[PDB]
Amino acid sequence: ELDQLRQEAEQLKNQIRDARKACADATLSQITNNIDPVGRIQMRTRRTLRGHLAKIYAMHWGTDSRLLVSASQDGKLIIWDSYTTNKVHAIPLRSSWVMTCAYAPSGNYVACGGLDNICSIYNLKTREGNVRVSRELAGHTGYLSCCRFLDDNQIVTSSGDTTCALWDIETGQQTTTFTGHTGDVMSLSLAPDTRLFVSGACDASAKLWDVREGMCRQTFTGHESDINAICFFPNGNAFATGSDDATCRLFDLRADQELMTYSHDNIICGITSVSFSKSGRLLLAGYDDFNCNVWDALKADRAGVLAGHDNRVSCLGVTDDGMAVATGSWDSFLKIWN
Template identity: 45%
Template sequence: MPKDPEADKLKDELQAAIKKIQETHTPCQDQSFEDLTSSAGNAPKCGLSIRKPCKGHLNKVNSVHFAGDSRHLVSGSLDGKLIIWDIYTGNKTSIIPLRSAWVMSCAFSPSGNFVASGGMDNQCTIHDCNNRDATGAAKIARELIGYEGFLSSMRFLNDDNIITGSGDTMVIHWDTTNGKKVNQYFGHSGDVATMSLAEDQNTLLTGSVDRTIKLWDLRDNKCQQTFWGHNADVNCVYMLGNGFTFGTGSEDRTARLWDIRSDQQLAKYDPPNGKSGFTSCILSKSGRYIICGADDNGIHVWDTLKTNHVGCLSGHDNRITSLALTPNGIAMASCSWDTKVQVWGL
């Protein structure tokens, strides 16, 4: 069969492009994200304000997470307590004393029946909110041990299954009914710092101090994609409800928007002062805003399409450590080293 010079040329160009991406992790784009979205109208004004200040912690608060009912919130603090809040009233519904005060992460099960926490004690402790002791605190239902590093992140799939990330580079799926590992996911070369589950619970995103984000398929237990681009620790990752788009925040002082289908970064968001490292991030329910907590005590907001900074929410006096969005998208919670938990709404 005679050679086709044009086909050979295209093949060589394609192989060169693939080699460039593999060597430099630089995506190929025929048009910029800003050009593609230039015709989009401006986003509505972000009118978030503090609706319920939740006061009760006595030390730095490191993590917040909502239950599936969009009403109950759990927060974990270095005062050695988990507090469950009713955000409609701002009142505490339960205070759970912990065996270790070094809490780094906490999570609510979607049903609201269980809360989990972990940190420098190198274990994940699960409390049953429906089974309380004489003081009214939720009893321990299960302790998951076997880590060689701190617990940095965790998310329930349901009441019987939880996924954890830790400082020993591991991501583990646990059966909480018997305390045994269902699966273990290997791939990161540094501490796993953050995770986010897709709404259909088929895929999981993890971010690490190795500067990468990995996409895992929980059905075949494999890493499907690895995303490069950040120049420092990836502190936070958040999957949008469509299951294809996610946001990240990093110590490299940038937030970024990514697309799983195109296997690349779509947009980058810089703080106005260029000096803010990002500790936490969420995307609004519509995806039009990316919201990031920073070490400059502010919560920064960008229009994801226009990529412009549209405001900074003030309400904390120290480093923001965690942000959480209600499943219905109508409210947001933040926590900080200033000991405060704030609930924000329109």
């Protein structure tokens, strides 16, 4: 009965393609004709942080938009005071291979994970002074790539086992596992309400998960190569995904199909990080060409370039107050742009 179910799947795929096509009447690009362009923007490196010796792989901004976290292959996970470029903590790591970092919304905990297939959670407000490893989660058969905090008790991680998992830090078990992806996943972005997230896999298909129910709800496939990073629109109805084929794409979950694409003929380097701004007008996008590009999210046109990194930027993220954007490249340099 394999042929019958295969034919049913093909027919249903044709039906969903027809439904998606029938829901499209006009592209966003021509609708955005009336919008005046944002114009060229110039961003200067207000602050530069110099405390790392190896390649920086990931970071996260604090909730108060003052505190940073750093993750590098040197084995050090430092927390920066962005305004005064100070160091408040320096947490050594058991394994020097680190691929992600996370900052808790409450500012109490910090998570980390890399090629050791284990997510480590540190308590930064211990009564005994220094920061210690509060918990240690090990339930994946592959490297972790992204970690995000729902609450102080829940963490969602993206690993190399082609699955996404939701943990309960109080006891450290698999509360819910998310299966369905056929490739490695290295993208995570939780919606502002923190009840729904989207992850980007290597099969050129980012899927829309559900934290409560535990099952996938929507599947978006418009890319051609692996997904390197994903971000969620501040509204919560759209999200942007950066792939390895040197292009970014803006999907919408309510319309459940493409809206616009961001590509340039001169750009050949693949995307590494993608983020938005407070209003969603600007789409910051890291590149492997040692620079970051600022795209007009509505006009699908380039607005400016923020260069100044010797090596490729492996991380990028704007502040919660939308006052600065921080980029960290492989040259162990973090720069704050305002």
